[PDB]
Amino acid sequence: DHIRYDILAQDALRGVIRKVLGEVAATGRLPGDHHFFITFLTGAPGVRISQHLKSKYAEQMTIVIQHQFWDMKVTETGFEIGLSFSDTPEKLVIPYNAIRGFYDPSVNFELEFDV
Amino acid sequence: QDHIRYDILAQDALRGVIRKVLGEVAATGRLPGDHHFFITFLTGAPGVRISQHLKSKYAEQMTIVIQHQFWDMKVTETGFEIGLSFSDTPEKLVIPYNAIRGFYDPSVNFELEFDVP
16 A cells, blocks of 8 residues: 555646646647636635635636636646636636646546545 | 647656656565556567567567566666566566556556557
8 A cells, every 4th residue: 555546646647737738828829629627626725816716616616718818827836827707807826736627628638636 | 629639648647657656666676565566568669678588478468567576676767677587587678668558556456558559
């Protein structure tokens, strides 16, 4: 039991999500008809949100990076993005370890983690 | 139309798990707990270095077991090297990571598969 394959795998997969949106942010544009549905834990450590959003999605929120999003920056720890809302601009930092689900419908790809 | 190819990205990532695990063992020199690996690879793939004895005994695929009697395990950038005994004649094997087709750890029922061809 000395080997935590489950952890190792999820860090590895986690790092795929890093590479991906890592190159989407490089060019600012999203390739072909691609787009992501990243589901994360609003209260996870490392997460940077607003009491506004947190008082809206107490446990977990699901953003959607499509057509045009903004300010997306991608670090080894997580991704920062802009999220224009009906009444206020929001900017959240979502650390990878906080992501519990990544879904890309264009190529029917799905990742799920234990949070 | 896929511009990202998640599969190739997931595969190299998981292949990366085999690297740190095999690399951790190569460090110490002993498998932890009841862990042991069933590594299946292509004897034909390039970079693979095995003897005529084994290449003839095994056509294209082969499954090796790292458990009780292994020596000189060296993890490199390209793949890894391991020493095992087959029918009492010691052997040295060079397996490049991209030649691995499957990795199984019966100890904790953990298996990984790749498109080795």
